[PDB]
Amino acid sequence: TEKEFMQHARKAGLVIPPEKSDRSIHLACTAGIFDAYVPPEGDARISSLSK
Amino acid sequence: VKKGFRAAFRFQKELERQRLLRCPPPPVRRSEKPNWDYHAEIQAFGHRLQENFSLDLLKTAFVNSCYIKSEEAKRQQLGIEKEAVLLNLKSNQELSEQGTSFSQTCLTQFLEDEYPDMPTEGIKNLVDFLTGEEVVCHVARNLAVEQLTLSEEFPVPPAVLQQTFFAVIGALLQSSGPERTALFIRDFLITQMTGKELFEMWKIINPMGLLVEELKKRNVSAPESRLTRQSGGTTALPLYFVGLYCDKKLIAEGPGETVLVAEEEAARVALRKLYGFTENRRPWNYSKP
């Protein structure tokens, strides 16, 4: 008559591999884009071959 | 763990039993189950009916036009040319037409010389019942032509089942004379009339008008309806007895819960007594002449 529950867990992953190790994560992409291509304002007006 | 193998296997088979029982699968054609061979099934269908079919005409009878069009669409969506065999599939249309025409004329001849008093409308309704969709679908399902039917939509919607059943009737008409096909349609359609009252097939609406027209044909003047016996007129479960007297002479007697339903039932009883289709009639003489 002396027993309690188990399984105290959490549902939020974190930044554990920099808490310390000698293996870094090999990514395969980047964050976003380098410098945005701003389109011309009248590209629909310039929808033909050239102008 | 309890060591061993046979109990765990037996429980696994029982789990597969309950798991297949909870969610039953969509049923598949018998031609797509492992134990199947079409030619031997055609020969066994020919031999079990004590008939001598020519197998080419039975194979002609069991194809359908929807099967031909779906097979051609399947051969064209893949691009494989099947112009070798599919141009001689020769669907069962003309055999089905010969079958329905011959079965109609022979059933009308049977029911005409069996019943001399039946009007043409009544024998027309009877042959339309016996060659109708329901009972030929029943006979077709219990004579395994649905397993031999080549079509789409595996439940085989009953119009095309009727098509194949009259097709194999026409195949018997081609392969053997009118006597053999007459014996076949006797043995597998006239037996479906057993135990059924006449107005369970004809389904007339106003019987008293039909009775007074029939008695005007027989030159007996007018059926006047007298109440004969009743037991309980004020309760909620009455019982009446109406007798139809033509010229102070009884012709019928009908019971019912009210006088209208009992008079209409006496009209039905008089109509069956006049037409020679009663429960006391001669049962059909299934024999060999």
Partner: protein, 166 residues
Amino acid sequence: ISRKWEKKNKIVYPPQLPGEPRRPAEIYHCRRQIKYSKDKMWYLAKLIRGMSIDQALAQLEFNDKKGAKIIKEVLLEAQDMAVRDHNVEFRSNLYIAESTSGRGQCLKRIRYHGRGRFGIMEKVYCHYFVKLVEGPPPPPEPPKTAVAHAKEYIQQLRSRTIVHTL
């Protein structure tokens, strides 16, 4: 332990044909390990059973039980999940179709009775289940009138046969 109510939100039906009915929405939700008995929770789950969601929230905001606030929070988060994710557009257009409660995992304690004797106190826990279906609440089945009873009795008197012969 078995969690099957939570997986019922991840069913996906094939897309309907135009000549078909609407197939109204179904939303399953539950809250596990409630510090409450299962029978007192069952009385509230029977109170709710058939009513619409707004009438259920009304009857639970004024019911003086510990389970009432818990079921009101569960119903509010189920309504919010129904409006956001499960493609229900009218918030009041929901009725409870299934609502029940099951026994959860328990613990055990001593009672220290009035000699060198004792009992086994159990710290009870329970679950709550709920299922919402969009559309109006279906009407209650009316009590069958005298003509229905007379029709059933006359039909039973019609259906009898000559027994134990031919």
